[PDB]
Structure formats: C-alpha cells, structure tokens
Amino acid sequence: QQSTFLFHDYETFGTHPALDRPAQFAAIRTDSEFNVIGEPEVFYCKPADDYLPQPGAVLITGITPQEARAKGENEAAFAARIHSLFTVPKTCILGYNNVRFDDEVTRNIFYRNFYDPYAWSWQHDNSRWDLLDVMRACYALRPEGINWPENLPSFRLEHLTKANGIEHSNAHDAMADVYATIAMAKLVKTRQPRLFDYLFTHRNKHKLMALIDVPQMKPLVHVSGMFGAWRGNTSWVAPLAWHPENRNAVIMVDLAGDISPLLELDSDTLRERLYTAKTDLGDNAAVPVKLVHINKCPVLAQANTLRPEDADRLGINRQHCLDNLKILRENPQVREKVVAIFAEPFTPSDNVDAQLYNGFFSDADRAAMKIVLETEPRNLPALDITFVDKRIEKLLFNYRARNFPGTLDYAEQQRWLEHRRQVFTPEFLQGYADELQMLVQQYADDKEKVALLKALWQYADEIVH
DNA sequence: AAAAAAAAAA
Ligand SMILES: [Zn+2]
Numbered sequence: 001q002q003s004t005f006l007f008h009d010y011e012t013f014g015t016h017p018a019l020d021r022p023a024q025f026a027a028i029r030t031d032s033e034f035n036v037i038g039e040p041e042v043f044y045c046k047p048a049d050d051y052l053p054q055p056g057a058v059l060i061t062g063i064t065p066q067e068a069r070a071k072g073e074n075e076a077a078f079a080a081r082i083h084s085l086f087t088v089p090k091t092c093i094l095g096y097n098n099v100r101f102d103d104e105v106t107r108n109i110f111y112r113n114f115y116d117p118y119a120w121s122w123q124h125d126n127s128r129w130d131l132l133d134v135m136r137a138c139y140a141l142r143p144e145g146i147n148w149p150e151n152l153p154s155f156r157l158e159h160l161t162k163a164n165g166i167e168h169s170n171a172h173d174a175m176a177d178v179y180a181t182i183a184m185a186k187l188v189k190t191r192q193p194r195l196f197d198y199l200f201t202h203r204n205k206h207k208l209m210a211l212i213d214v215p216q217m218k219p220l221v222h223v224s225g226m227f228g229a230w231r232g233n234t235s236w237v238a239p240l241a242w243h244p245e246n247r248n249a250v251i252m253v254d255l256a257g258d259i260s261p262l263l264e265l266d267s268d269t270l271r272e273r274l275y276t277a278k279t280d281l282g283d284n285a286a287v288p289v290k291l292v293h294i295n296k297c298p299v300l301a302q303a304n305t306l307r308p309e310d311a312d313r314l315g316i317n318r319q320h321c322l323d324n325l326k327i328l329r330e331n332p333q334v335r336e337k338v339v340a341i342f343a344e345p346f347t348p349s350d351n352v353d354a355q356l357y358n359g360f361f362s363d364a365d366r367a368a369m370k371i372v373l374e375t376e377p378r379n380l381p382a383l384d385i386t387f388v389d390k391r392i393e394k395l396l397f398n399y400r401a402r403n404f405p406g407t408l409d410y411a412e413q414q415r416w417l418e419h420r421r422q423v424f425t426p427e428f429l430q431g432y433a434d435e436l437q438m439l440v441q442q443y444a445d446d447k448e449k450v451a452l453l454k455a456l457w458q459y460a461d462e463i464v465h
Numbered sequence: 466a467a468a469a470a471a472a473a474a475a
Contacts, residue, residue, distance in 0.1 A: 009475095010475090100475075228472055274471095277471080278471060290471095293469095354470075356469090
C-alpha cells in the first residue's frame with residue numbers, strides 16, 4: 001500500500017446536505033506528486049420519489065432530475081461505491097470547499113444508507129484536506145509567483161484557473177472541477193513548497209494544538225473566509241478558552257476588531273450582539289469573537305508567519321492588535337464572559353434525515369447495521385433484530401422505501417404514500433411552482449436555462465401524479 | 466476514533 005490523494009467533487013440538487021440529495025460524484029486518485037492512478041470515476045444518483053430539487057441548483061449545474069434518473073443508480077448503490085473508494089487505506093480525501101460542503105454530504109449519504117458517517121476520514125491512516133483554505137492562505141502569506149483575480153480577490157475555482165492559464169471548460173461539472181482542483185494543487189506545491197508542505201502537515205488536529213496555548217493567549221495568524229476578502233481573509237487571533245460544549249472548538253479573539261464590548265458589556269447582551277445581524281447594530285461595535293474548529297482543517301500559524309510587508313498589503317495594523325492582546329492578558333474576567341456566551345440548549349427536527357448529530361451509534365448497533373447491509377433487501381422485512389437507537393428503525397424504513405420500493409408490502413406502501421402526500425402539500429407545490437415561474441421571467445432571454453425550468457416543471461408534474 | 470445541526474465558497 002502507498003499514500004495517495006483522492007480528489008473528489010459533488011454536484012447536488014440543493015445546498016442542504018441533510019435534506020437535499022446529491023446528483024453527481026467525481027474522483028481521481030493521485031500519488032504524492034499529483035499523477036493520475038487508474039481511471040477517473042464519475043457517476044450519478046437516481047433521485048427518490050419523495051424529493052424535488054432546488055431550481056437554483058439545477059440552474060447552476062444543468063443537471064436535470066430526469067438526467068440523473070436515467071444514467072444514475074439508487075442512493076444505496078451510490079453510497080456503497082463512494083464508500084469503497086473512500087476507505088482504501090492510506091488515502092487523503094480532499095477537494096475544494098469540501099470540509100464545509102462536500103464532506104457534510106458524504107456524512108449524510110453514509111448515515112442514510114447505513115455506513116459509518118466518519119470512519120472514511122480517519123481509519124487506516126485516512127485523513128481529509130481542503131484546498132480552498134490553502135489558496136486563501138497562499139494569497140495572504142506567500143502570494144509571489146501566482147495570479148490572483150479581483151473585482152477584491154476572488155477564490156472561485158473558475159477564476160483562479162482562467163487567470164493562470166488552465167482549462168476551465170464547463171464548470172460545475174464534477175469531473176472538470178476535480179481537474180481544476182488538481183491544477184491549483186500542482187501550481188501552489190511548485191511555487192510555494194514551503195507553505196504547501198507546512199499546511200498539509202498541519203491538517204491533523206494534534207499538530208494544530210501544538211500552536212494553541214490558552215493560558216498565555218499566544219497570538220496566531222489565522223486565515224479564514226469569515227474575516228472577509230477586504231482584508232485577505234486574515235487576522236491575528238488569540239485563544240481565550242476551549243469551547244465549553246464543543247471539544248473540537250477553540251474560542252478566539254480577533255485582535256484586529258474592537259474589544260470595547262468584551263470589557264464593557266456582560267454575558268447575555270454580548271451573546272445577543274454576536275448573533276445580531278451585521279446591519280442591525282447601528283453604531284454598536286461587533287464582538288470580535290470567532291470559533292476555530294480544529295477538526296475542520298483551519299489555517300493557523302505563529303504570528304510572524306504574516307510578514308511585515310504582507311500585513312501592510314492587506315491593511316492589518318499590528319500595533320493595534322498587540323495593543324488589544326496586552327489589555328486582554330490583563331483583564332481575565334473576559335475569559336469568563338466569552339465562555340458564558342457559548343454555554344447556553346438546542347432542539348433537532350423530528351425528521352430522521354436531519355438527525356445525524358444526535359450522537360454516535362454504539363458498537364452493538366454497528367453490528368446490527370452491518371447485518372442490514374449484508375441482507376438481501378427482499379429479506380429485510382423478515383429480519384428479526386432489535387435496535388437500541390430510536391433513529392435506526394426510522395432510517396431503515398426510508399432506506400427501503402426510497403431504494404427498494406417493490407420490497408414494501410401493502411401497509412408499508414400505504415405509509416409511504418402518506419409520507420409522499422405530506423411532503424407534496426398544496427402549499428409546498430405552490431411555493432415550488434411560484435419559484436419556477438419567477439425564474440422563467442427572470443431568464444426569458446435564455447434558451448439554455450428555460451429548457452431546464454421546463455424540465456423541472458415536467459418532472460415535478462409527473463412525480464406527484 | 467468519530468459530532469454538532471457573519472463571509473464567501475459550494
Ligand atoms: Zn463542482
């Protein structure tokens with residue numbers, strides 16, 4: 001066995017990994033130096049009878065449900081084959097914006113189809129990585145030897161390829177975006193091996209904790225999209241405390257922001273202000289507090305990694321940062337307040353699709369679920385097992401109804417049909433139809449997009465009648 | 466060993 005990178009991409013029918021369903025999946029395997037191993041993979045997913053796609057999404061990808069209905073297979077066979085690629089030992093699974101999007105989709109596909117939601121990402125020396133954050137880090141820290149497009153720097157993949165001399169034909173097709181991803185990976189590793197190798201070696205959470213010192217509030221440069229392009233997605237942060245409820249989260253202070261509220265205000269108002277919209281503040285200062293999830297490949301380094309001139313380029317004032325840090329180190333009651341902001345319960349939906357983060361499944365249940373996968377769908381009803389987790393019973397019905405409709409008996413068929421009738425209410429279809437209509441006018445002068453809106457209208461019409 | 470449901474990238 002040898003270490004490889006697996007570049008992957010999804011195209012989905014919507015922006016919500018739990019409720020929306022996937023459409024296309026692509027992947028290429030490569031060695032340490034980015035050379036294709038074997039054949040690229042690209043497949044579709046046959047969307048079930050209880051789902052209509054977001055019009056927005058179909059407009060973006062050009063993939064109609066009929067398209068995926070034809071050349072794709074059920075979500076259970078989709079899941080199974082992505083699973084076998086993802087679980088090849090010593091694989092680093094990566095992509096573009098895959099940590100916040102694609103991996104979430106992956107987790108839910110496994111959850112719905114009885115695979116471990118997470119194992120693919122740690123077991124047999126597996127790991128994940130996000131290339132979007134690397135591009136951003138490169139622009140902030142070591143921009144020399146690459147072109148960065150503007151409008152303010154854009155990190156949309158189609159722009160970064162075009163503005164560097166790489167084929168970018170038919171974007172938002174999965175296979176092409178993987179190729180472009182591979183493209184940016186080679187470039188940066190060539191032009192900036194120092195930063196690239198550093199970033200890769202720091203994808204794992206244990207290396208990152210080596211940088212984080214709560215008691216000293218030792219400052220760090222942090223590149224993250226939430227900081228905004230108007231300052232290169234970069235600032236100097238300090239760790240105040242480990243999040244009281246989430247163990248993979250550290251509470252940072254953005255030293256570039258205004259620390260009046262933290263000194264002045266108390267626990268509750270601050271929480272209110274933090275979740276106050278950027279527009280409803282009036283004159284009030286923003287809370288310069290941000291969570292960093294150490295399992296989500298965040299970009300962190302020692303302060304001096306942002307070099308004097310680079311900080312000059314992005315317009316980050318170092319003196320004002322050092323000013324803030326020194327006041328904070330002398331004002332420990334601030335640790336109290338920021339902890340308190342995050343130390344308050346939550347309610348999930350009664351929809352089992354949206355329940356992955358209810359908690360891990362036990363050993364006993366995995367066994368159970370392992371046996372589910374090993375049973376012929378036609379013998380599932382006869383299977384005599386009991387599950388501890390309330391979720392599993394509910395997932396199993398959905399699995400069966402969505403992937404194996406013919407294995408349902410009469411009463412289960414009647415149950416399913418009631419589900420479908422509860423999804424496709426009159427109020428919902430009107431909302432759906434209203435949206436298509438709106439888009440049809442908004443694109444009256446576009447044959448390509450109206451044909452899609454027509455297609456979506458037809459698919460909706462047949463799937464509910 | 467694994468998680469958590471403002472800015473800008475999907
Ligand atoms: Zn894509």
